Amino acid sequence: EGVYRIMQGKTQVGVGIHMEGVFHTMWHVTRGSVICHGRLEPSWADVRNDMISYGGGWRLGDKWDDVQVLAIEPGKNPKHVQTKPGLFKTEIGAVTLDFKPGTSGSPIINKKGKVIGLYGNGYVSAITQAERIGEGPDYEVDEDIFRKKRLTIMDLHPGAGKTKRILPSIVREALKRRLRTLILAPTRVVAAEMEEALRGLPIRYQTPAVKSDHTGREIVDLMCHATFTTRLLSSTRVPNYNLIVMDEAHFTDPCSVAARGYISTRVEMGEAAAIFMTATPPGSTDPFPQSNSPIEDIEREIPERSWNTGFDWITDYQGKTVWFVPSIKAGNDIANCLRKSGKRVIQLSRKTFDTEYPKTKLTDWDFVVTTDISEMGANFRAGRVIDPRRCLKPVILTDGPERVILAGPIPVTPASAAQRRGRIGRNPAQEDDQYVFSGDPLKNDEDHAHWTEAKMLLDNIYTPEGIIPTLFGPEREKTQAIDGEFRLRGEQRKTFVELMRRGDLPVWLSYKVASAGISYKDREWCFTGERNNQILEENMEVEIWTREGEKKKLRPKWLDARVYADPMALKDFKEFASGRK
């Protein structure tokens, strides 16, 4: 609504224009900072040309070619100053007008009432502006995205809004339309951030520990992907949501894949509408998508273990980095190494995420060493990503006696790499953020255990219609499994759910045990394995003291790596093997 002085003992630094909802000013003035009124979001900036935008993209009336410079002097007053701009070659026009420092950002007017540039300081003072722009202010316009038997993908991107303006917008619209709305976060921490963004709506958070909750007053349910699925498995009460919204819909975690399959089935039913939010839709394969601010891509050899020299660019870099590693174990290596150098590093994995992410948001740090979990929603105030584009993938060895092993380090998918790189280049920075990476990604992940683990979840979810639910379209071509064969009747089914819910066991594992007719309470299968099935912890053969009072070596019948592939999961499987769980 007009023209403001950028005030910062501390006085006026520059001038900005607020037009059509967006705030415009020179780059040198804010130097990248935020402004206050509450806060003002720095969204866009052409750095070299010297200018920044707040709350969206630039707005223009025309260009030059007879003009006034409404100069807002510091400790002075607005005075309309009219002049003809020079025709200097460089094609940039400019005025011969010298106003004192702090004036930078003043509106230049072609004789109507529409701004055709900004006064740039500074031999002569340019009419600073670029090509036609731009995107759109922090208000959202939507369809038509609520009709039954419809599915929509929003590939949201860190501008205005995102988790900021888009989600509350559709929720406001949904409530206005009396739709029982469900929202799905990948992680508690992302759901928590949803709550602040929604503060003021009837939004109830829903624990996994509760199998269903119902009020019959207009409410909006907020849960983790896995909460949904486990409720779909254990609750008898199909709640008939008509709008389902999935934030970060690219999560290939089986509870996610499952959720997506069920949801897609409700849509085809005619029963639901669905919205899937993600920058990398399942089936997408660009590892270099567009981004809100410029990213410098840098292809360079990166340490996979400790190092002592020739990697100066690492330690020399004067800011916060994100480093994706293929594993907790690899991460210790790198952290251990970084710490030699006197670097504040925070480590993240699935298990530790909920208690260790907030440390990144709330304290002075130098490095994050993260597994791929940070591909789901993770938000960082960092400048550089270091991404060796590697990972471990669980595979069911079909080659004789079945087992799950952590294969790799193998290279990541294009999508996974897009997401890792997608940590960076959200906020305008003085230097373009840096994506430092190594190797090409690989797209064939069809032997990934998660696909069949999903079908295991999926075809054990029962619908009143009697339809077996199935994988979301683009994800169907990832198994040759036939719909329904993993279905498990009787209380083999109930066991299969319990082991997952209370036993904390992976899907595949949970499956093999239930379908053998083993009762949850029974734990002998943890000890009746073949010699080559012996678990080891830090290089010693694991022994555990039973609830009936015996020492036996940890040797399960069916071997699934994910129980023994990081102390925290292994601490757990030990408690299960006891009978504490």
């Binding site: 609504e1 007009g2 023209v3 403001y4 002085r5 950028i6 005030m7 910062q8 630094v13 001038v15 900005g16 224009i17 037009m19 804010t30 900072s33 935020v34 402004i35 206050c36 009124h37 006034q68 409404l70 807002i72 607005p78 509106p107 007017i109 004789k111 109507k112 009432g113 529409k114 701004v115």
Partner: peptide, 13 residues
Amino acid sequence: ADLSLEKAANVQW
């Protein structure tokens, strides 16, 4: 607080 605003004028002829 680090920087704020103050409405000075409006866009005119």
